[PDB]
Amino acid sequence: GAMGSMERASLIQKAKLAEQAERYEDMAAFMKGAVEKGEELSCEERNLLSVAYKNVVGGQRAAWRVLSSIEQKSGPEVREYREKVETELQGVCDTVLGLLDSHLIKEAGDAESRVFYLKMKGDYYRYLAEVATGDDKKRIIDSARSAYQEAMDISKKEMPPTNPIRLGLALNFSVFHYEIANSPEEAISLAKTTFDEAMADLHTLSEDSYKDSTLIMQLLRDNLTLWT
């Protein structure tokens, strides 16, 4: 790894500089190097990793969607360039999934972090599924579901129903059901159950926590309205 010779603390420092400079590919590379040192990540570091790769993959996804729209409207050039962007996106997703499997998930020291990483694993398989076809797509869909479901099992046992990480996991898993797995019934059931179980506990929360939880509940609601 190109970052193997740099101190962990220097990589974290440079990841934060890269963020300030809006250099998200650099930020991701620095965070990959930090992960590959083999130590657990703090909550702040976990978020740096997620922000960096989300920005990178988000730009690739947006570009892929532009090109796919041009391709559907329509020589081989549009397809070729869409395939080029697609291959780069798959590369980034494979990189993230590799960090999670080697070895962030298994080394996560608490339930919050394990759910955070398993949700991430579901998300990055989901991004692969958006561009996959055929038998490969079917395998990717099963991998996404299994990661999300393990995260769900842990969050139900270890986190309160208003916890924002648990809510965000349920949001993304329900999007997976609807948009990827063609299972609108499962998407609606999951979003609804999550919404109701959080609503029951809103009165126990501080002002800031109430805002956090209702913000994500409203994201669930927006999707329920679209789906219903």
């Binding site: 997620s50 922000v51 949001l171 993304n172 994201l219 999707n223």
Partner: peptide, 6 residues
């Protein structure tokens, strides 16, 4: 459908 924004 939109996913979690962060």
């Amino acid at each position: 459908t939109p996913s979690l924004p962060g």
